[PDB]
């Protein structure tokens, strides 16, 4: 997800501007829907989650605008438990205490019911391994451990009039960890880490840790007022894009794993270069396709030198010459993506990591993809020339083999056509004759998971985009009807509606449509109007 806020001293309007785009899998219908909801207490427009009241994360109320990216706070620990008692007891300190065991059942369409055990220790439920074998993994997560009052925030946030009032209204939010970026008509901008994080050692971030030793227990909660925040920074720019929120020498442990800083650095670069940032400038940032890896790739392929196989040498030459842009019109971007998928597969196979998921402790739905994880580590290993996992191969041997394999996988399609998402409705595989009706239409789009236009993929499956911006938005704080937004298919969840897939056209162009706030304009422009009346 990306977002950013630009202070009044650096905007064309002399008021704050906020903009961004959340990135999630393209499940259908889209997770976020556009709504405007007004009553005597508030008048709010933004994104809702169908099935949930209010505007948890993306909205303005005519005084404060706010939006989020996932903060990558570490809110989930895994504990390795020692069991005895045929799985009925678990060690804590030097005592084995009773574990809770119960039975439950699910029904499965077209198959037999499945009965199963639910086993719970002082840490949380067993999610992997068989306690009867003496060891299993339990999960202690902020999402489940203790009473959560995030829903009390949904009635408090609509009343906020300033960035600071909005952050006080978010006290107690713990369901999901967010970078909550806000701006207000008084001219302030801010970033709050809106999360509940337990106080415990940094070691818990690396691996499942011993549940019995007492050394890895949660010691209370990091207080609200200790969470990282900034309001009105002196450079007039805030950017978040799932990158490391604070340095690791911060006194509370908050994060081990987060995205690479590519997207934050590219947004920051574009904003530092524009100290008269206009509402119209947000779309060009949303659309940015420069890959951070072009320099590393070019250097390593040049040093590798000419290949014997003619098709591999053609591919090498095109990659050394590539401008690094994942533009929809680029055929060479597709060849880069095929090359990197082939390299990731070869490294995952040679290392033995493809088979790491054969272990019983891997069995946590939906499972880890070895290539999908190795994909993000390859740039570090290649930049450092660390060939420790290649069982005797050098990176040069891996790159050369990847040129050969990839040369047989070149379709020649522009990246927009190669990467075009196949939006799949949840019932399309059960009702295949209906897939043409159920699946919303898609257009060619560029980007990859490293670019600000973060249309990512599943590397073990192929190049098609599987996740990306579910919505894009820009808030013009204090000139609200100039704000804009879009979603990746449309307002309707009904496959037959004119509004099921109509916003895919602007979204695929990295354009937005008006986010209308004024009631007289809304009334004048309404296409349907309905009265909901007392019964």
């Amino acid at each position: 997800s990306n977002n950013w806020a630009v202070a009044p001293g650096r905007t064309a309007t002399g008021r704050p501007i906020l903009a961004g785009d959340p990135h999630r899998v393209f499940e259908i219908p889209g997770f976020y829907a556009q709504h405007h909801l007004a009553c005597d207490r508030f008048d709010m427009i933004g994104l809702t989650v169908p099935g949930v009241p209010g505007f948890p994360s993306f909205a303005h109320n005519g005084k404060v605008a706010y939006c989020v990216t996932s903060a990558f706070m570490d809110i989930h620990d895994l504990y390795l438990e020692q069991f005895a008692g045929e799985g009925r007891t678990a060690r804590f300190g030097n005592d084995f205490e009773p574990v809770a065991w119960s039975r439950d059942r699910i029904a499965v369409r077209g198959g037999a019911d499945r009965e199963f055990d639910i086993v719970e220790t002082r840490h949380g439920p067993v999610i992997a391994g068989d306690p009867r074998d003496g060891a299993a993994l339990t999960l202690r997560s902020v999402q489940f451990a203790e009473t959560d009052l995030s829903f009390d925030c949904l009635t408090r946030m609509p009343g906020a009039s300033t960035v600071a009032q909005l952050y006080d209204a978010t006290r107690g939010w713990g369901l999901i960890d967010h970078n909550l970026v806000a701006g207000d008509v008084a001219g302030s901008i801010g970033h709050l880490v809106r999360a509940r994080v337990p106080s415990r050692p940094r070691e818990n971030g690396w691996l499942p840790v011993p549940g019995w030793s007492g050394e890895h227990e949660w010691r209370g909660w990091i207080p609200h007022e200790a969470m990282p925040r900034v309001i009105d920074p002196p450079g007039g720019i805030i950017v978040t894009a799932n990158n490391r929120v604070v340095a690791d020498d911060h006194p509370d442990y908050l994060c081990t794993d987060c995205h690479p800083p590519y997207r934050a650095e590219r947004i920051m670069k574009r904003l530092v270069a524009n100290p008269a940032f206009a509402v119209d400038d947000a779309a060009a940032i949303h659309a940015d396709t420069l890959s951070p890896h072009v320099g590393l790739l070019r250097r390593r392929l040049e040093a590798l030198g000419a290949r014997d196989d003619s098709a591999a040498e053609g591919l090498r030459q095109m990659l050394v010459a590539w401008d690094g842009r994942m533009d929809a019109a680029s055929e060479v971007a597709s060849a880069y993506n095929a090359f990197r998928r082939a390299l990731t597969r070869l490294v995952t196979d040679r290392s033995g990591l493809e088979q790491a998921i054969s272990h019983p402790f891997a069995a946590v739905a939906p499972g880890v993809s070895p290539q999908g994880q190795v994909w993000w580590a390859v740039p570090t290993l290649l930049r450092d020339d660390d060939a420790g996992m290649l069982k005797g191969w050098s990176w040069d041997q891996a790159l050369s083999e990847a040129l050969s394999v990839a040369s047989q996988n070149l379709t020649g399609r522009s990246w927009g056509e190669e990467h075009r998402p196949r939006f799949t409705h949840p019932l399309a595989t059960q009702f295949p004759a209906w897939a043409g009706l159920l699946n919303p239409a898609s257009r060619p789009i560029g980007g990859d998971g490293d670019t600000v236009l973060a249309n990512g993929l599943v590397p073990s499956a192929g190049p098609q985009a599987t996740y990306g911006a579910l919505s894009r938005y820009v808030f013009d704080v204090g000139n609200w009807d100039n704000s804009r937004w879009v979603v990746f298919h449309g307002a309707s969840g009904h496959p037959a509606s004119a509004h099921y897939a109509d916003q895919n056209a602007p979204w695929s162009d990295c354009a937005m449509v008006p986010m209308l706030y004024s009631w007289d304009r809304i009334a004048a422009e309404a296409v349907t109007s309905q009265e909901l009346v007392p019964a």
Partner: protein, 216 residues
Amino acid sequence: AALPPLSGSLPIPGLSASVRVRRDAWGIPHIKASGEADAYRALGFVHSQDRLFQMELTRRKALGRAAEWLGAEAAEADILVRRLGMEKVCRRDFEALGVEAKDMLRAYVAGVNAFLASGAPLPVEYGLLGAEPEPWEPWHSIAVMRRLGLLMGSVWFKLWRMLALPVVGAANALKLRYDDGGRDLLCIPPGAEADRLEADLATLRPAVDALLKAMG
């Protein structure tokens, strides 16, 4: 004929006054109510008019009932949310909320259930599945919200490093994490950079040893 009516007038039991819902050229609903309870009743009704299958499928995924619609592909995910105790923690949370949030949730599901009682044709997916919608309770919205964000982030990286231990060894497994470009750009302070801490194999040695034994 297979879409719900978006014009005219429809009743909602429990509304205090009328609510007007105007859709713009993109179908986006702009909802104008008098009081706050009516606003949340209207929002539950309007979410159901456009997204009822999404709402019920996301609630089934939270409550471990999605394999009833999706088949075996969803069985292991249903078993995992039953083991996490979704219903228990969402009823826990609801009971502890303030009056204003309980009343928000009650009004919102009254809106959903009025839509289910409104006589609209069911969405195409209920025809395909031979299904009928089941009614909503106030704590259901807490399960839907919890499902949206279920288990994202750190737990997968930890699980992955553990799985890598018996394959590539501790020193290599503890380099399995997303790249930092050589040096992170931090969010706070804005523009600041820093080198991340690498794993301390010495302090992790008891955890590594216990996991290798447990896994072997």
